[PDB]
Amino acid sequence: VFPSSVYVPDEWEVSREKITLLRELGQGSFGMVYEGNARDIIKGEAETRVAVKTVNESASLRERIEFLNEASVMKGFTCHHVVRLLGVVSKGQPTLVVMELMAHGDLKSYLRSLRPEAENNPGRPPPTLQEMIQMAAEIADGMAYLNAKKFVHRNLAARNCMVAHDFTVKIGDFGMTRDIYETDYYRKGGKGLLPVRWMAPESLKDGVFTTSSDMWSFGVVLWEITSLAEQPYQGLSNEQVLKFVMDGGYLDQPDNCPERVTDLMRMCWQFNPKMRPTFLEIVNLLKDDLHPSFPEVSFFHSEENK
C-alpha cells in the first residue's frame, strides 16, 4: 500500500513568489498553518489575505503525497460555508496549500475570547440569540453541502469550525489526521484517537460514522456555542463519557440557554440515529430568521440543492 499522487498542476497551481508569510496561526494536520498574503490569485483583487499550510520536515513521502491529495479533493468544493482552497504550490519543497483566511480563527478559541473574564476579550458582548441561530444555520449549510458530496465529517467540533473576518462560520478541517497533543481526543487501545465527547452512542459502540452521527456532533457544537466552549461532560473522564453516552446520557443544558437552541440540541441527541434531523432540515427550520445575504450564498438556496 502506497498512495498515487492525484494532484494535477493545473489552473490551481500558484507561483511560490506570489505568496508572502506573515505569522504562525498554529499546527494543523500535516504542518504549520500561517497567515499570509497572495498576489493576483483572485480576479479583481491585487492582494488577497490567505491561510497557508506547509508540510512539516518530519513527514514521510507518503504523508507529503496525502497532503496534496487532500488539496486536490478540495478543488471540487465551492460552498460559502466550507473553508475553500485558493491555490497550490507543488513545485519544489516545501509544498504549500493556500486557503481562504478565517481571520477570527477557530470557533472554540473565538467563543472562549467572548467570556466576561477572558484576558483577550475584544470588548463585544457574547453571541446573541440571532448570532447563535446564524452560526447554527451556517455550520448546518456547510455540513449539508459535505453530505451532498458524500463526505462524512466524523470530527465535527467548535475546534475545527472557523470564523471569518465578517463572523461567518464555516466548516474547517474534516480530514482523518488526529493531533496527539489535542486533549479533545481519547486514545482508545486498538482504535486510535477518538473525539469521544462529540461522538454518537452508535459510533462509540460499533465504530460506525454517518451523517446522523455528524448531527449528534453538531448538537455538541451548539452546546459549545451556548456554553462559550466549556469542555463537554466536565468532571467526567473519557471512559466515564463513553459509558454515559452509550447508556443514553446526554449533556445538561448550559446555564440560561435559549429555548430554541435547547430544542435543536435535544433533536440532535435522539438515541435512534433515524430520529435525528438532517442538516438540510436544520437549515429549513432556521431559514426565516437569518441575515438577508444567506439565500444569495447558501448551498440550501442554490441550484445545486437537489
Ligand SMILES: Nc1ncnc2c1c(-c1cccc(OC[C@H]3CCCCO3)c1)cn2[C@H]1C[C@@H](CN2CCC2)C1
Ligand atoms: N483557513 C484557515 N484560516 C485561518 N486559520 C486556520 C485556517 C485553517 C484550515 C482551514 C480549513 C482547512 C485546513 O486544512 C485542512 C487540509 C486542507 C488541504 C491540505 C491538508 O489540510 C486548515 C487552520 N487554521 C488554524 C490552524 C489552527 C489550529 N488550531 C488547533 C485548534 C485550532 C487554526
